[PDB]
Design a protein around this ligand. Structure first.
Ligand SMILES: [Zn+2]
Length: 121
């Protein structure tokens, strides 16, 4: 699903503030990460990123490409492609626990200064 800036904002309510990170920062990051596309798939030679956040099949989820994935989030990857972001978001809550917000390099580079433009209302 192609999402609008405000749909995102709405659907990441449960991520709001988590690890000190704010929804504009999330909007700004999800945008640069996926262009608000919950079904984006980038399959590289060796790993593959899924969904609104682009979670790679080599650490967090499991797929046919990397069966020796840790599967930290205990979950099949194609679940990060559907329109339901409930599981998408608990995975990402782990990633914050274990690495944190700089795991996404876009955030500090682009989602830190001008958060006004990522607010919904
Ligand atoms: Zn999902």
């Amino acid at each position: 699903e192609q999402l609008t800036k405000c749909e995102v904002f709405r659907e990441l309510k449960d991520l709001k503030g988590y690890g000190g990170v704010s929804l504009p920062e999330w909007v700004c990051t999800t945008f640069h990460t996926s262009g608000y596309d919950t079904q984006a798939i980038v399959q590289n030679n060796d790993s593959t990123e899924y969904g609104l956040f682009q979670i790679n099949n080599k650490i967090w989820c499991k797929d046919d490409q990397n069966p020796h994935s840790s599967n930290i989030c205990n979950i099949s990857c194609d679940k990060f492609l559907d329109d339901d972001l409930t599981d998408d978001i608990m995975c990402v809550k782990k990633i914050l626990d274990k690495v944190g917000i700089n795991y996404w390099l876009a955030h500090k580079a682009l989602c830190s200064e001008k958060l006004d433009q990522w607010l919904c209302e």
